[PDB]
């Protein structure tokens, strides 16, 4: 299927408690494969998936230098944004950035990303054209003018169309045992009486990869979107994910309810029912 590579970065200032903490992680699809934490005893880019361990020492040197430089520029930018927003030096603030690429089954670029947030709000984003910027406010417009004057977008476009896709394709081949394997959900319905009048039907999806999935309840063939309790997809800790959807059902009417499951590891969507 389709694939993605993403690098995530977070810097959090902490006035009076040293310099901002910097954490960055890299993902292919939903698999974490590299990390760097400035608060580690000896900060270095570290592998987190077996298929990246084979990369040589020069790779880990390069990635570590880039992460360290990113931590330093983030520190400078945190001071800059205090000025842009007329903020006191006394508070903690957050700078986030994500960038990366999406490719289709043939490995062609589907789209690229590079976007930033300040204190959890969108700040500046490279548009899908990979050539223009969307600034959220007048402070981000100051960055936009700087980045336009330096033609930053053209440097990002070159990376996202070139190295990002080329190295994603290499990682997909080196990790093809895992990165190119979808694990379908294991599904079942449980029944939990609430009262003499109602019971919860809970539709489970377990052990699936990647995280994207659709679980829905129907009653007499009609979607129950408004009456379904849907928990956020959650990691099991073994690479796979879990999710459930629940509906409250009048006692005796359980067979009018069907759970429907869509996942890229399933050839055709599943339909299941409570089985007493």
């Amino acid at each position: 299927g389709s694939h993605s590579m993403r690098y995530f970065h977070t810097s959090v200032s902490r006035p009076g408690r040293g310099e901002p903490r910097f954490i960055t992680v890299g993902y292919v699809d939903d698999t974490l494969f590299v990390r760097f934490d400035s608060d580690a005893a000896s900060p270095r880019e570290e592998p987190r998936a077996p298929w990246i361990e084979q990369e040589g020492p020069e790779y880990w040197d390069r990635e570590t230098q880039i992460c360290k430089a990113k931590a330093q520029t983030d520190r400078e930018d945190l001071r800059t944004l205090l000025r842009y927003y007329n903020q006191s030096e006394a508070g903690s603030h957050t700078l986030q950035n994500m960038y990366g690429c999406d490719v289709g089954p043939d490995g062609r670029l589907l789209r690229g990303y590079h976007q930033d947030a300040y204190d959890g709000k969108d700040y500046i984003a490279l548009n899908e054209d990979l050539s223009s910027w969307t600034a959220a406010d007048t402070a981000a417009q100051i960055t936009q003018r700087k980045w336009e004057a330096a033609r930053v977008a053209e440097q990002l476009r070159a990376y996202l169309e070139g190295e990002c896709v080329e190295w994603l394709r290499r990682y997909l081949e080196n990790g093809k045992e895992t990165l190119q394997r979808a694990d379908p959900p294991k599904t079942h319905v449980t029944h939990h009486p609430i009262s003499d009048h109602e019971a919860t039907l809970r539709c489970w999806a377990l052990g699936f990869y990647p995280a994207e999935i659709t679980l829905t309840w129907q009653r007499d063939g009609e979607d129950q979107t408004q009456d379904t309790e849907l928990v956020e997809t959650r990691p099991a800790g073994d690479r796979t994910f879990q999710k459930w959807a629940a509906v409250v059902v009048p006692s005796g009417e359980e067979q009018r309810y069907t759970c429907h499951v869509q996942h890229e590891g399933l050839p055709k969507p599943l339909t299941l029912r409570w089985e007493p």
Binding site: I66, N97, Y159
Partner: peptide, 10 residues
């Protein structure tokens, strides 16, 4: 691998 010029001054 990472963008070598991802450290960009805002």
């Amino acid at each position: 691998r990472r963008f070598s010029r991802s450290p960009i001054r805002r």
